[model samples]
Target: ALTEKTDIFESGRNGNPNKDGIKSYRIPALLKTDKGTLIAGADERRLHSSDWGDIGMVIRRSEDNGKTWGDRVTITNLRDNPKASDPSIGSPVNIDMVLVQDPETKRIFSIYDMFPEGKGIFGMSSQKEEAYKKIDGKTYQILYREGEKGAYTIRENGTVYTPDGKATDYRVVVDPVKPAYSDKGDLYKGDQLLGNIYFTTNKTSPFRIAKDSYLWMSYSDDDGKTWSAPQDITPMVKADWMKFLGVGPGTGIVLRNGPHKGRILIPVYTTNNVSHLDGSQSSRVIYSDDHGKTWHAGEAVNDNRQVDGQKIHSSTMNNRRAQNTESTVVQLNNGDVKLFMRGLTGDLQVATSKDGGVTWEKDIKRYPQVKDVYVQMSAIHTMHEGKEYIILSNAGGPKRENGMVHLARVEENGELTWLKHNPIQKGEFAYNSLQELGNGEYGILYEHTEKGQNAYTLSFRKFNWEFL
Candidate 1:
């Protein structure tokens, strides 16, 4: 690993193929591929950091670690395409991407959420018609509205029938105005024709999907040199009530021990409440057992505020509920999966799962030392010099500053002791991700500003176990 700190991308730096007419970069994701190559990714925030509008997923690779890098590559580009015109009022945005590598296959997968120009969690939150549905013991979200009352459900394109099954007096009114498209082939405004929802009845609410936000995945087999086209996996994994679905903004892991060994797991979050800061958010995992061929959903780790039959206060009752989001997970040496999450309480929360992430133990624990101001963080489990340990990187905060890395040791009882922490940057810092490089070294890719502001530049730091 390189000893000196290096800068990868400075905020507002322009003249790149991925930037759609000058946008800043945020949300750093880092991974060490099976071939020993480094894959780094970030959200090309084409507008602002507001998680909406003109966002694209981009990545770059380092064959020689932090010493050098290749050109910026936009793996999932939906903006700045001159050939196709976009109809949305703004450009489409992709945000909060996470990465996971299949060790056996060596395929690095990038998972992210791509939202249409007018739709994000906040924009589509009030439209209750497109929430979620329960049928046959499974959950499904209604992607579109239908029928005279807008009561019937519509997702892709199937059939909308009445309660009698032949449908009935149901009348599907199609918005006569054609949706407007941007010069880049994005939907600027307009309602979906098949359903009763409208993006804008002259710039207003009930904005439905001409195109909606969906989860997508793209993979690279040759260590980030090239990538496959984006594949849609929304229908299989997303639940309708999960109004805002996103990734960990870091790298995922494949379990090395236990009955479900070799299972590939990535952290994901979903929430029904969109108005509040925490908003009923919870973290879950999506896994693949057959290598990279097939995937499945695991149970979610949630903060229902009850632990071992006692009500726990996640946050003060007045402001907002305790919601968990933007989390990281690592498989421990004892085969238990531990997760560290961003919570509303101004402190970091921790949870553990014994049955391979299908279920979690009750009552989330708060770490005062693992302090946070509700920014995203990263964690990893490793063995150094015959001693097992876990390392976490985050902006230890009363706000998004004081970037630090904490070192911890697991007790036999499964509790963690944060022995010490090393501060990396002293200024404004936000989201960060960690990867275990070879031979007792690690790499951190993080968001930091030049002065005290946040999200100015994505920086890199490489260190070894000897530093501790």
Candidate 2:
């Protein structure tokens, strides 16, 4: 039976800027720690409902399953600049969070998209420039003058150095662990604090980030009690040609049965050489084999290229001709990985991986039974009454209105037999994520709008296998 339903985050209610309540909340990610703690995360859109502008990551945790949740915590540094009046402009945005736990070390990681002081996907430059430089075998962020021929790099203790190895007076104030300057710290010359690298509006500052999207990660070893300082993993996972790369905004999987068992796999999507709206977007996975010490990006599933002597194209259900975007992954009992991707296709597209998500098979499968209006969806493999099953949560209506949950039994041959399509909410629905609790219960964090409300609220609901 369906056990409980709770509103964890309400728009216009728990705003960071207090004065103007959070205009909207979007992109839900749910995770359950090995200790049975439940963590829910979402994008706290402070400025408006749009994708850009003053967005930060917020999370809530529940210790007693889905019974009660704690206070909201702002995980990312958001420059809620009071003087800034424009809601359309960007300001150090952090959105689309994905949560995963490493079973070997019991550490939980929160990975998300990070942008510094500029518009997000639309503002990225087409020219692919290297954002970092290697000096003495170490990587450092490189900076270039607006119209100069030389380049500069930020080095040890935030010291700026010229191309000829001359140390300059400029220094970016950075913490030993935390990303201070990139978050809220300022640039300094000798002993004087000049301006912030993230506050690009101030022309006086010479330091600014490349107007492109970045991927950042933070980990917690104490079951969501505390998190370590964030580290940028963009250089490790993103290619220079990529315009934008973002997480799939759900729970990642830790391989349980395979030669690559214990590997951490996080679903992500990327766009190269052009804007994502142009249909260049494709789904992939970033994985770690050494317990979060290092990460590697996997090959894309739908890159609009030929694979195995066959031409690959968008799904036939994709009447709009859009490529694959937000995606989710689940590992089957037979040690194979399955990816569920959301495209303009009216249904969900799937790809299988035999080598633990490094490469996907060329044959992309579509499930018309699972309805999707190009909205983000979530899936998880779980057990019910001693039987294995895979459950998916997504929007059921033609548009983003009715929220539905579908269940399928995992057969002996590692194939899914979809059995049930259950409706959960009747109102407006958008992005969502799912996680299975220890018992026969499961939890979902989703975006929902009230009858006449203009913004969306992050709601949490719990149900048992009997409800299916």
lDDT of each: 0.67, 0.78
lDDT per residue (tens digit) for residues 267-336 in model 1? 8876553443444567778777877666666666653456445543222221243567778998888899
Candidate 2, superposed: residue stretches over 4 Å from native: 13-20, 80-87, 176-185, 274-276, 303-322
Q: Write the per-residue lDDT of candidate 2 for residues 1-468, one digit (tens) a residue.
A: 775458887776433232346677788889988888898988877667777787877788999987889987667665533334554674767778899999979998999998766677666666766678777899887766556656688888888888798999998766533432233445689988666655556445676655578898988898876676677899898876676788988889999998999999999988766445575778899999999999999888864445456555332112124477889999998888999998876887888898999887767777788888888999999876678899999999788979999998878876677899999888788888999887788898988877444457888988888887
Evaluated at residue 174, the lDDT of candidate 1 is 22
Question: Could you tell me which residue pairs clash in candidate 2?
Answer: none
TM-score of each: 0.79, 0.92
Q: Which one wins on TM-score?
A: 2
